[PDB]
Amino acid sequence: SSVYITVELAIAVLAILGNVLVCWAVWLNSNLQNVTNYFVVSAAAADILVGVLAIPFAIAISTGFCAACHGCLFIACFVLVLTASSIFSLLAIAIDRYIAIRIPLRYNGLVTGTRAKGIIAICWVLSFAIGLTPMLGWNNCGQPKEGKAGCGEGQVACLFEDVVPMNYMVYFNFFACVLVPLLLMLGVYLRIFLAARRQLKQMESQPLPGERARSTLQKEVHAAKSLAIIVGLFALCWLPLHIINCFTFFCPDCHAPLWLMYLAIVLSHTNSVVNPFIYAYRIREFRQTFRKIIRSHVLRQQEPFKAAAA
């Protein structure tokens, strides 16, 4: 459906705009320049690449244009590399927040700029490795479906499920790229929520009653509700599609309809617009820099059209 195409491109636009806004905001505002926001900006940079490249490629993965088998496989693998990078760098934000809340005394000496650049280098090496695995031999290109070839000789209708094996999708891709990060981000959230709960408990003993503690609680509560949003949206966005993959593979009896496939693919991509944008938006310092960039842009654009009194 062209309804799928337009929704897909609408999301691609929002993915670029929101995340460019996050990258501009960190580049302009001096106060936003800390190690946490290197992770935020890396997730944002990975989201831009999803919007600019991965989403267009994922549309071609549905249109079924005629291509060589491995060339079609190449396009599908690149979707996987670019989406994985967006997941792994989002996970880095979560891990950074965990170390901030659990070990606040040692955070600065521990999460240094050199180490942060190392963590995101690993994210890409991970995304390349998992995403390009089907290219090294784990593919369906041994038996190209030539019945559908009206394609030329040695060409196939370029479909994801045609070229990418479902045992790779379920055993490797779903496990490594969705479930494990989701389980870890959930783990991180539960611990951050726990710390905040225990903190409030010990303030109720009121030995001070507390003002150093008062802000600590506010930090932990803020971090708790931010990570609830990250994880909740991540699960809402990525689980439906991958469960369908487990549906298709683990249950060869029972297949999902076409409209449902598109909806799930679209949902998978919308994680790139909301994560980590909503996390960023939730910080007041991000929100006020957003307002300044937007308002400045609108005023610089509208001023030539604004007539003086005479």
Ligand SMILES: CCNC(=O)[C@H]1O[C@@H](n2cnc3c(N)nc(NCCc4ccc(CCC(=O)O)cc4)nc32)[C@H](O)[C@@H]1O
């Ligand atoms: C790292 C995580 N990456 C991903 O999950 C990314 O890969 C892609 N994807 C992961 N599973 C899948 C998946 N089952 N089908 C697709 N498209 C194919 C759509 C489709 C296939 C077959 C048929 C029936 C054939 C016919 O009779 O006409 C119709 C539509 N893309 C995926 C997504 O773009 C995601 O963002």
